[PDB]
Amino acid sequence: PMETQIISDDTWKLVDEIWDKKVEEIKAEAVIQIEEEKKKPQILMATHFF
Amino acid sequence: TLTLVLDPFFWMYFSWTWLFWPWFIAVGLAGYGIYCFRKHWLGEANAFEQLGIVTSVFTWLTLVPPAYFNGYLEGWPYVFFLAYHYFFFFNVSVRKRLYGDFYARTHDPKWDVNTPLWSRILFGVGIMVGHW
Hints:
This is part of a larger assembly, with chains A and B.
Chain A: H1 10-31, H2 46-49
Chain B: H1 2-5, H2 8-14, H3 21-42, H4 47-62, H5 64-70, H6 76-88, H7 91-97, H8 117-131
Helix pairs in contact in B: 3-4, 4-6
């Protein structure tokens, strides 16, 4: 053998980071995605007139 | 109900109130207006109810006082009742043409200027006082 180490140990840290960010984003997206209170028409826009 | 209806004397006394059929509507609609105002204050108002809120304000402004003072409405109060509604329905068209719909969007809280509520009520009451 003659080949020493290759790309890095820090690039593995970066790819672990992006893996964890995507996993956490999926985890957050799965459970807090749907919540609805109301969508009422805003047809008394008083800040234009009153 | 039947002895109320087919009694001619209740027909003499209940048709005795048709002289104020103009005053049945102009006050009965005010209760609907204030009820819809409270419902919108809670946050559950359809488009018709908010239209009825501005209609209640605008009609109760323009048409009621001269009808109260002279007993006959003919001419300028009618056309200014039309003109006021034609005036206020102008943010709706501009904010619908260059938009998807009338739904409030997301923005920063500091952008819209607020003003103390007592002054707003004072403005409305002064507008009423000046119109009467």
